[PDB]
Design a protein around this nucleic acid. Structure first.
Ligand SMILES: [Zn+2]
Length: 251
DNA sequence: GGTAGACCAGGA
DNA sequence: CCTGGCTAC
């Protein structure tokens, strides 16, 4: 799930779990649990706490309980569902939170790449994985000035810069390629080579692209005609990722 | 201090 | 082979 999908999960999942009290936590793939390191301590500490809220930071979900926060990243295929404890579990269910009302919050992840960290609420923002997280892309805290400052002080590509969670929170591969196309900038350009005008343009397209999605031109379209000029879209590797662009319209 | 690289783990 | 967000040059 990308940022807009995580925002949808946050909004839709909250009313399905708010006010429920945890009676048990069952873990079927302990590697998902990253803090406490011991999955038995993770399960034990959550028992007896009631769900009070659900927030999002980048692509992280922050479940707010009584004393603790549970910070969850779904990576590529993680999914949450609420259902009855009476029914058989679906495949790839790796963590289940059992509530006192006989319902459960189930975490499924065929890839097993997702992560869970639990800390006292007041500690969560200063611990992994939230600690060094950059500003929300749709917030005033993410500005052209902030982007420009990061761009000039790196030798990396502009794509590598945008994928960096410390620069801007949760801006995924798909939106990086789409935004760069909409801004007319090649993904392999050194970040430090962007002009002031290019940085402002890029900022505007990043906000427009992810904003529209929260409320495709190139991604996955290799070999197909550009929707703007008809030139076939190309795919290469940039910043170690599949990268799509129009070689005519991006410079 | 920056930055590349390892790392995870299963469906094509 | 692709992929989001602790180690070691
Ligand atoms: Zn084009």
């Amino acid at each position: 799930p990308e940022l807009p999908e995580v925002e949808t999960i946050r909004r839709t999942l909250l009313p399905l779990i708010v006010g429920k009290t945890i009676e048990d936590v069952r873990i079927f793939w302990p590697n998902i649990i990253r803090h406490p390191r011991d999955s038995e301590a993770f399960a034990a500490r959550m028992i007896g706490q009631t769900v009070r809220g659900l927030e999002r930071r980048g692509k992280f979900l922050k479940f707010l309980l009584d004393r603790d926060a549970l910070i969850s990243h779904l990576r590529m295929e993680g999914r949450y569902a609420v259902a009855s404890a009476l029914e058989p579990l679906e495949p790839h269910t790796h963590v289940v939170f059992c509530f006192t009302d006989g319902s459960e919050l189930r975490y499924r992840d065929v890839r097993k790449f997702g992560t869970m960290h639990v800390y006292a609420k007041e500690e969560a923002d200063r611990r992994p994985p939230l600690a060094e997280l950059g500003p929300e892309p749709l917030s005033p805290a993410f500005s052209p000035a902030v982007l420009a400052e990061r761009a000039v002080k790196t030798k990396r590509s502009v794509k590598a810069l945008l994928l960096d969670c410390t620069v801007v929170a949760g801006f995924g591969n798909i939106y990086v390629d789409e935004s760069l196309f909409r801004a007319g900038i090649l993904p392999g350009r050194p970040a430090a080579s962007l002009s002031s005008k290019e940085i402002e343009r890029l900022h505007e397209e990043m906000v427009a692209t992810i904003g529209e999605a929260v409320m495709l031109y190139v991604y996955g379209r290799q070999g197909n005609p550009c929707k703007r000029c008809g030139t076939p879209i190309e795919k290469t590797v940039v910043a170690g990722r599949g990268t799509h662009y129009c070689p005519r319209c991006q410079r």
